[PDB]
Amino acid sequence: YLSSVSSQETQGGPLAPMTGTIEKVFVKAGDKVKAGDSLMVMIAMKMEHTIKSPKDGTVKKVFYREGAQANRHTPLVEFEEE
Amino acid sequence: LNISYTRNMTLKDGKNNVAIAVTYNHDGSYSMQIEDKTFQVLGNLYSEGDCTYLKCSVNGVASKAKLIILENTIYLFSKEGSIEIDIPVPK
Amino acid sequence: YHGDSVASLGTQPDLGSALYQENYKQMKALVNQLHERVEHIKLGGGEKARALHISRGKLLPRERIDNLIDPGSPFLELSQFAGYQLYDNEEVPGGGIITGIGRVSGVECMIIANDATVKGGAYYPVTVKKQLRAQEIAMQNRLPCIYLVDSGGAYLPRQADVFPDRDHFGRTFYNQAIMSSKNIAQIAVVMGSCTAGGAYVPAMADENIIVRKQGTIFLAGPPLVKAATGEEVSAEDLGGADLHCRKSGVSDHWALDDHHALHLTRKVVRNLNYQKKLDVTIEPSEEPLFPADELYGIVGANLKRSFDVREVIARIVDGSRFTEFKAFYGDTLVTGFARIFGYPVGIVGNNGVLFSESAKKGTHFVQLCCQRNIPLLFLQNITGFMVGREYEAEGIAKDGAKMVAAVACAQVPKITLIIGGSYGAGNYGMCGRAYSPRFLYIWPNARISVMGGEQAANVLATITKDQRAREGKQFSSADEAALKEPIIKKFEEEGNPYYSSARVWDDGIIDPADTRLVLGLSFSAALNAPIEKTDFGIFRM
Amino acid sequence: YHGDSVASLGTQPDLGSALYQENYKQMKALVNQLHERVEHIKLGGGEKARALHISRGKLLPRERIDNLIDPGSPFLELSQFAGYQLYDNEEVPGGGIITGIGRVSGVECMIIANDATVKGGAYYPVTVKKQLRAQEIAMQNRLPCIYLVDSGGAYLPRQADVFPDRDHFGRTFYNQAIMSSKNIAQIAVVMGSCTAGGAYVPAMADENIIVRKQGTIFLAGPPLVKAATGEEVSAEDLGGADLHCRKSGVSDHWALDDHHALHLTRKVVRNLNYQKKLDVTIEPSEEPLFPADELYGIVGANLKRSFDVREVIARIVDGSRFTEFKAFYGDTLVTGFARIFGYPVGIVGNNGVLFSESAKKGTHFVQLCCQRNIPLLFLQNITGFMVGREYEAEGIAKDGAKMVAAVACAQVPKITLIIGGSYGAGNYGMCGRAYSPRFLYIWPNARISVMGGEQAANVLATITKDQRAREGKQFSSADEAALKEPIIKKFEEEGNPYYSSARVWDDGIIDPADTRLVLGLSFSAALNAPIEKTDFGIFRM
Amino acid sequence: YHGDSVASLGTQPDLGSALYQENYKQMKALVNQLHERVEHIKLGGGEKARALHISRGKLLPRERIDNLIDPGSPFLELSQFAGYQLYDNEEVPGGGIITGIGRVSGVECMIIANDATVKGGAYYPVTVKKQLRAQEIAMQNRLPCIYLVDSGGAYLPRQADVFPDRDHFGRTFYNQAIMSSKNIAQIAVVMGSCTAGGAYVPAMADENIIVRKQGTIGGADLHCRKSGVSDHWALDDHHALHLTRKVVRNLNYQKKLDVTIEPSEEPLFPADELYGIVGANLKRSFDVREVIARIVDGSRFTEFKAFYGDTLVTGFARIFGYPVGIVGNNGVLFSESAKKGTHFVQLCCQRNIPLLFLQNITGFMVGREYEAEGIAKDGAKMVAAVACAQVPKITLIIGGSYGAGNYGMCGRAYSPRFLYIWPNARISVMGGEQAANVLATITKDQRAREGKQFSSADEAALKEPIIKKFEEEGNPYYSSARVWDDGIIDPADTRLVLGLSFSAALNAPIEKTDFGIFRM
Amino acid sequence: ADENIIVRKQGTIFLAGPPLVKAATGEEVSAEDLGGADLHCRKSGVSDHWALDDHH
Ligand SMILES: CC(C)=CC(=O)SCCNC(=O)CCNC(=O)[C@H](O)C(C)(C)COP(=O)(O)OP(=O)(O)OC[C@@H]1O[C@H](n2cnc3c(N)ncnc32)[C@@H](O)[C@@H]1OP(=O)(O)O
Ligand SMILES: CC(C)=CC(=O)SCCNC(=O)CCNC(=O)[C@H](O)C(C)(C)COP(=O)(O)OP(=O)(O)OC[C@@H]1O[C@H](n2cnc3c(N)ncnc32)[C@@H](O)[C@@H]1OP(=O)(O)O
Ligand SMILES: CC(C)=CC(=O)SCCNC(=O)CCNC(=O)[C@H](O)C(C)(C)COP(=O)(O)OP(=O)(O)OC[C@@H]1O[C@H](n2cnc3c(N)ncnc32)[C@@H](O)[C@@H]1OP(=O)(O)O
Numbered sequence A: 001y002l003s004s005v006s007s008q009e010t011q012g013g014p015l016a017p018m019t020g021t022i023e024k025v026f027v028k029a030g031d032k033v034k035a036g037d038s039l040m041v042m043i044a045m046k047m048e049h050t051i052k053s054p055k056d057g058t059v060k061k062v063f064y065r066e067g068a069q070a071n072r073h074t075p076l077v078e079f080e081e082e
Numbered sequence B: 001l002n003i004s005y006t007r008n009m010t011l012k013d014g015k016n017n018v019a020i021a022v023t024y025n026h027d028g029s030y031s032m033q034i035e036d037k038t039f040q041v042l043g044n045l046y047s048e049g050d051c052t053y054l055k056c057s058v059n060g061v062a063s064k065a066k067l068i069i070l071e072n073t074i075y076l077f078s079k080e081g082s083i084e085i086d087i088p089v090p091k
Numbered sequence C, D: 001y002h003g004d005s006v007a008s009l010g011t012q013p014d015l016g017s018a019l020y021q022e023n024y025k026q027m028k029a030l031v032n033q034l035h036e037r038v039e040h041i042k043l044g045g046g047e048k049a050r051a052l053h054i055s056r057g058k059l060l061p062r063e064r065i066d067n068l069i070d071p072g073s074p075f076l077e078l079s080q081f082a083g084y085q086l087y088d089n090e091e092v093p094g095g096g097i098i099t100g101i102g103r104v105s106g107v108e109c110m111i112i113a114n115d116a117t118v119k120g121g122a123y124y125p126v127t128v129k130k131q132l133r134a135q136e137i138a139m140q141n142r143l144p145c146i147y148l149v150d151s152g153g154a155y156l157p158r159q160a161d162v163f164p165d166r167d168h169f170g171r172t173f174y175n176q177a178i179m180s181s182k183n184i185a186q187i188a189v190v191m192g193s194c195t196a197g198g199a200y201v202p203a204m205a206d207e208n209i210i211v212r213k214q215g216t217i218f219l220a221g222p223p224l225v226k227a228a229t230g231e232e233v234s235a236e237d238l239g240g241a242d243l244h245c246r247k248s249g250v251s252d253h254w255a256l257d258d259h260h261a262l263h264l265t266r267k268v269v270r271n272l273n274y275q276k277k278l279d280v281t282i283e284p285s286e287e288p289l290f291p292a293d294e295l296y297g298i299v300g301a302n303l304k305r306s307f308d309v310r311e312v313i314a315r316i317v318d319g320s321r322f323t324e325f326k327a328f329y330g331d332t333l334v335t336g337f338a339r340i341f342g343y344p345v346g347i348v349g350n351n352g353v354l355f356s357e358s359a360k361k362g363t364h365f366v367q368l369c370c371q372r373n374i375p376l377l378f379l380q381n382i383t384g385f386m387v388g389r390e391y392e393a394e395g396i397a398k399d400g401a402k403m404v405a406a407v408a409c410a411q412v413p414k415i416t417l418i419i420g421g422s423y424g425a426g427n428y429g430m431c432g433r434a435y436s437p438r439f440l441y442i443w444p445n446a447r448i449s450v451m452g453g454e455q456a457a458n459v460l461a462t463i464t465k466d467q468r469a470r471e472g473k474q475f476s477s478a479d480e481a482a483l484k485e486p487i488i489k490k491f492e493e494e495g496n497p498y499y500s501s502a503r504v505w506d507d508g509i510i511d512p513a514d515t516r517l518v519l520g521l522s523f524s525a526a527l528n529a530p531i532e533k534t535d536f537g538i539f540r541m
Numbered sequence E: 001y002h003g004d005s006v007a008s009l010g011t012q013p014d015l016g017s018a019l020y021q022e023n024y025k026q027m028k029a030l031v032n033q034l035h036e037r038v039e040h041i042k043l044g045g046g047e048k049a050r051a052l053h054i055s056r057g058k059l060l061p062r063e064r065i066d067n068l069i070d071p072g073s074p075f076l077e078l079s080q081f082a083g084y085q086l087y088d089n090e091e092v093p094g095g096g097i098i099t100g101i102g103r104v105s106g107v108e109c110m111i112i113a114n115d116a117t118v119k120g121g122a123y124y125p126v127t128v129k130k131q132l133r134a135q136e137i138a139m140q141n142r143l144p145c146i147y148l149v150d151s152g153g154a155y156l157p158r159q160a161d162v163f164p165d166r167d168h169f170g171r172t173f174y175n176q177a178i179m180s181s182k183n184i185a186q187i188a189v190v191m192g193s194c195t196a197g198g199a200y201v202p203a204m205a206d207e208n209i210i211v212r213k214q215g216t217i218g219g220a221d222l223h224c225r226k227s228g229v230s231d232h233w234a235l236d237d238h239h240a241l242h243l244t245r246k247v248v249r250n251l252n253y254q255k256k257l258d259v260t261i262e263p264s265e266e267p268l269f270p271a272d273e274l275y276g277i278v279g280a281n282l283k284r285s286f287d288v289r290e291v292i293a294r295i296v297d298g299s300r301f302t303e304f305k306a307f308y309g310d311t312l313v314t315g316f317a318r319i320f321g322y323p324v325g326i327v328g329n330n331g332v333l334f335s336e337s338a339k340k341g342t343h344f345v346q347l348c349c350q351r352n353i354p355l356l357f358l359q360n361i362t363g364f365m366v367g368r369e370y371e372a373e374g375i376a377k378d379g380a381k382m383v384a385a386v387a388c389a390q391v392p393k394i395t396l397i398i399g400g401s402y403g404a405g406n407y408g409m410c411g412r413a414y415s416p417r418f419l420y421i422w423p424n425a426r427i428s429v430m431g432g433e434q435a436a437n438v439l440a441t442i443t444k445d446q447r448a449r450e451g452k453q454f455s456s457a458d459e460a461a462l463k464e465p466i467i468k469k470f471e472e473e474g475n476p477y478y479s480s481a482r483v484w485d486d487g488i489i490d491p492a493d494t495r496l497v498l499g500l501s502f503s504a505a506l507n508a509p510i511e512k513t514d515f516g517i518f519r520m
Numbered sequence F: 001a002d003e004n005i006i007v008r009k010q011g012t013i014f015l016a017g018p019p020l021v022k023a024a025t026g027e028e029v030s031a032e033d034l035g036g037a038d039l040h041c042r043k044s045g046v047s048d049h050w051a052l053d054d055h056h
């Protein structure tokens, strides 16, 4: 626990930070993106949020499109199973 | 302060409602406006035995009658006649 | 044995004297002007706004207050003239809010109601100041606070004067939380659609009452939500009586309409389990021996003439009985004991220029009143402290200061009434607004400023001419006259009572004929809180 | 056994990244601008005024402060930017007054010195507000007050904003008397000619020191005396050191010149018989593990980008040791325990939009800190409260409110630092200026307003267009655009940190590199007063 | 102005409905059973013992209590069923002691009298328990204690049960000394022989009264003329009671109330309808608002948060002019109900209003979604809020009380001033049927882990003992035999019992309430 | 408790266990899902600290 090992063991599926508008999407219907690559940028409040790839696998589908409203904690990028 | 308080009260006479605007004068009298007519009213309640009586003057005319307030009805008993007025019940 | 006979103050004025007639005429004109202006302010925001408000099924704020309080009980409205010509082109009748003290279920409470007809209930800076003053009064006197919330939040223009600072909007929530922590009940009645600022008020209140359809509590309105998130949603769905009562749980009571909400509010107050107890002794109340309307002739409207404050005292005290203290020492100041509506009071009035003897006498009287736990009443007709080389040698500053120190440290209830001029350090000495009196009132003829206009122009002129001569510059005599004439006008405009009451500085202008009633109501309200011990600082001897 | 190893916060930033370089460049430019403006303000009133002041034999106010405090001790100046461009054509460097906290004879004291070079020491409204803020700080922290009185009284123009109201000039004397009554020492050093307002200050002070010739205390100056009565008298005769020390008795000590007066002031502070005692536990102080100057690159100057507040915490805490509380619940808010200069502190920082979970977590942490009597530190980077139909259904307003009540009712020392945006009710939730933090500071890149400029224009536009459509009026699309563009500019101008500090809204802007030192000094000063018990209101569960 | 017209709670039940008739019949049978059992208990220790006691010239304990209290004043006896079938073959009517609250010389006092007819006044463990509970009640409410003493001392068999532990006899003396220190008066009348070392009970008392011949503190003549232990000498029982009344008068005590008071008004509906409304079957559900409407002054109730968490009912009312905050159960507890209860408790504590709990709880809602939303967190806040409250608290169990719901609604462990149960109540950790399923599943799974096989028939056989045992423990007479739940009360007398209890509890001043951390 | 520490996998806080939940309402749920360190730390918020094992 001192070496921060438990800090690494944390993972979760992509989700919308809050309810707001999706300004643009960096992930197409089928694309290969490494983890950390931006998927979409969302502006629900005064700030702006960029979504990073939770995993390096190819994106299966894009649930939302630009100008759409995304509910809180809702999936945006579907990742193909590996 | 610097204003005269006017109270809007509704009294049901028979089957028709009546709206009265009462103004609380500084001298203690009341000015009631019913429809387009105004009346200057003053009086007090004095109890004889177990019966409460209302002595009042309306536009300079004074009269006395026994006053009974039971449930939502007001009973005014006098030699000239008896009057029943119903206070509207809030919904 | 309380029946020993006692001499009574006051004398019968000469009605036939021309001076009395002129003073009466001037005071009557001033009072008529005040009454007509108050009527226009009471008219409300406007005809179209009132029509829309009635069409939405809601009650007008004054009707709400009338139905809320006990039948026939007097209502003490505060700061009716707030915002009077304060802004250049915008009219804000009453500051957009209504505040006062009335009796609800036999309990004296402070009522704050938003006037939705004025700018849709938006909060101007004067509105925030008025609400803060009302909250401070309630906290000091330990009065329950009732909020009739119907507002559109802070006025978006002029946001800098409403949002950021300490005495800005957040102080409202701060005071609400503090008073709730101190067992002073907070009750919020959401009688209409609130906003982000309005929404927090019901949340912090101990008990909430929300109307079924008109009441809507949303932390951000539909337009605000769209501007932020963009989530289109109806007002009722985002915030509504049914939602808040059933799912959100913010609402504590559900009301069908305005009358039902007021009835529910009366019930909550009944359940407060509060009993008022008095510390001061009480005696049967007796009316003064002279009519109050003679004050018009006695005082008049000209500040140059001087009138004996003993007449004013004799026309506002119970039975016109007054026990003067140190009558022949420092006679420019009048102090003594009397009773108003059975309440003991210590009266401190001005009869001329303040001197060292007057300051010492006032300090002694204030110490006595604080020791005996007696409320203090200040009558201000001050025009200054005598100043001169000999007066400075005596220590007029020192003497003046020690009065001021005592007044500040006093913990007894303090009520200040300005019946005439109030200038310079005399305002501070006689319990000015800066020294936290429980209430402050002014008569229509009062003038308040740092100094008289003529004196101020002379002081500026001497400094500029002397400064120019030392600099080697030349100051023209005509230039000095040109600077002085505007100064006299500026001081007159600022001194006018209406200008002072437009800012929240005064709890309100009052007709002199109603002074006794206003003082009685104020003292009855202020006696709710217990009287604490008084601790004094160093007295500079 | 206090030696078990504990993990340390913070990480090494990537210096080579272009984002770091750009942020560092922007922050360096902002800090250089701030430093140059502070230098110009420190220059003083002007060259001619400074020359005259030196020719009269007096010391410049900054020299007075330097000689008064202990040798080498740091000085924490407050509100250096007060009055910066506040008035259209008049320049008031520093507001005309100097306030700060320094150590005199081993005791932390609040020092208030008038700058005679600025308008002859006349009191502008901002000067009164600054002095009142300093007095309030001293009263809250129980710090002795030292006044270096050299003033010409209230500015005769703009008298309405300085004399009448509660927070106007009289509040100075009120606070002086109250703090004297509460055993907080008041010391007045009359270093120059005072006036009617200035004269009262030495009178109310417990101890006075007046210079032999420069010092002159008169309740009314020679010009004022002539205006009021016409009496001609020299300044020294009317008020002077010899007169006040001998015949008058107002002066308590007689000083030959400025240096002698400062030496006497130091001696008087020594004789205070005061010892500082701490309630909180203490531990040896350790420096943070990372350089402070990296904060420039980490934070930058663009509010759109987001940075982890944990970096800021790691660069300002002792040893970069942080114990996070509820790390995975409401992760947009960061709370935990740390120590600054050995003082325990509870840190509450913003990492994103506030939600219900964040509000509940903050309320829990505040309750814990109040129970354990631990000082609280707030880092504000708030952008507002989450708004939405689902959020309203949950009770986001309810959740937000409980935080507001918890923050308001807290009695522990509280310090707020605004490192980024502060808008809406988020400002109130995170211990805004209205909730009485002991100190408040902002970084040069902060922006404070009711809402972002673009959002505000949209909210006004929707109301006007919808209102017009309901009225049957027509609102042109071009008119809506014309209204919105000015709004973005107005919000930007008001939000700028310099505008906020011109008003006393904040205690002053601080270089991010000095945040640790400023916080340490502030907490050391605030620990003088004992920590009282905390009483909470109803928590709306 | 207190004249505003207010709506009244309650509705007229349908007398003709068969359900009402059946419920009324069952409740009437239960009440008749309770009355007959109470009569038999009141009979006393026995005929021969009573004859001997009368032959010695002494008065029976109930006669002593009747003569001690003011004429006609009601007497609130406590724990009449203590020791009912508690021991296998020994009968201990009333636990061997009599405790109650009555008015002596216009002052409410707690009276503890030993019944010499039961085992010669020896102290059974239940007796010690009863006496400790009475002393605790008196200390909490600041009531003077009067100890008529006729004790034979500790029962020598069962000595371990009555002598060593803190909750054993020693505490009786400790409480007496502490009450004296706090100025709560302690008065002891030795109306009977103290053969054992019970001499300490009068010695620690502030004032003693000893009868001339019956009372031995070892000789009455020694103790009265030489030992001086005696502060008063009485010729017989009547003289001793008269002296006790005089001693109480000279206490120099005046009762003062903190809460506001209003004129008392009777409820708008008869109390006997509660029999039909509630019945005796716990499976059926009844609206607690009826019970509230039949026991409050004028049937006036101000509901708080009516539509939020409707399974719990909260509001303000007045009983005999005393303000009260009523918290009743109308169903399963949920998160909203817990939050609403916490809010109401905070309000009542802030306003210094006594609290009344009506328990009909069946447990806390359990489920994965409920666990996700912190039912555990919420249930706890309600429980803490209840524990930290300092206002007087009275709990009445009108139905089932199981699981953590008992703790949440001011159970016996949370120190209510008084606790009562109706004859149809049931109390236990969980329903008997539910408990049977839980044990069988754990054993079957444990066998599967070890490779053992659990027979289906064996699991069902294991369940049958659990079902029968749970019912016997839940019976009200089982809980009343132990000193838990004070005594059982007829539902028709609920209003009178609550009024007496609140009047007694209002003697002590109401202190400020300090709350712990609220786990928001 | 003022402060809670729950182990990642061994620690499980449920107001009613799986067998108890089934007995009361006949609902089937795993022990970790009904009550677990991750759930209590992240969604229910009952847990105040998250620990990997006993030593942590
Ligand atoms: C606390 C913190 C920390 C933050 C906040 O609080 S941020 C709050 C943001 N506010 C809102 O989000 C409310 C937006 N209003 C509305 O949603 C409605 O309007 C209502 C609810 C107000 C009801 O009013 P309504 O709609 O029934 O009538 P209307 O005539 O339209 O009412 C008057 C018209 O409002 C215009 N108007 C001007 N200034 C404002 C203002 N500040 N707020 C509202 N309205 C304003 C006025 O100029 C015009 O009339 P005029 O001047 O043209 O004659
Ligand atoms: C509390 C209550 C209840 C009441 C009061 O307090 S009522 C107080 C009345 N004040 C006095 O009675 C002091 C009158 N001053 C003087 O007696 C002197 O002046 C001194 C003492 C100030 C020393 O100053 P000094 O004489 O050594 O130099 P000077 O350059 O002349 O100093 C600057 C010049 O003063 C002009 N100036 C503008 N406004 C004021 C102002 N308000 N007070 C003083 N001076 C002012 C400035 O405009 C010009 O310079 P500028 O702006 O033209 O460049
Ligand atoms: C506090 C500390 C720290 C220590 C102590 O306190 S150590 C106390 C030691 N006790 C004595 O020293 C008193 C010894 N009694 C006697 O001196 C008398 O008896 C009296 C005074 C009790 C009057 O009673 P009595 O004499 O008038 O009538 P009796 O019928 O005889 O009364 C019933 C009969 O007493 C039997 N019996 C059974 N158990 C006891 C018991 N524990 N105490 C007394 N009697 C008991 C009962 O079984 C039988 O009747 P039964 O059950 O056979 O039908």
Ligand SMILES: O=CCCCC[C@@H]1SC[C@@H]2NC(=O)N[C@@H]21
Pocket (backbone or CB within 6 Å): C382, C383, C384, C385, C386, C387, C423, C424, C425, C426, C450, C451, C452, C455, D196, D219, D220, D224, D228
């Ligand atoms: O009303 C006129 C005031 C006279 C101005 C004199 C100034 S004001 C404050 C101070 N007190 C005095 O008597 N003189 C000065």
Ligand SMILES: O=CCCCC[C@@H]1SC[C@@H]2NC(=O)N[C@@H]21
Pocket (backbone or CB within 6 Å): A045, A046, C196, C197, C219, C220, C224, C228, D382, D383, D384, D385, D386, D387, D423, D424, D425, D426, D450, D451, D452, D455
């Ligand atoms: O900084 C931008 C504010 C975002 C809008 C949020 C609104 S504005 C006022 C109100 N108070 C809040 O905290 N949120 C809403």
Ligand SMILES: O=CCCCC[C@@H]1SC[C@@H]2NC(=O)N[C@@H]21
Pocket (backbone or CB within 6 Å): E361, E362, E363, E364, E366, E402, E403, E404, E405, E429, E430, E431, E434, F015, F016, F020, F024
């Ligand atoms: O009355 C039946 C009890 C069923 C629910 C209660 C179960 S058993 C005890 C435990 N405590 C609770 O809070 N719920 C469970």
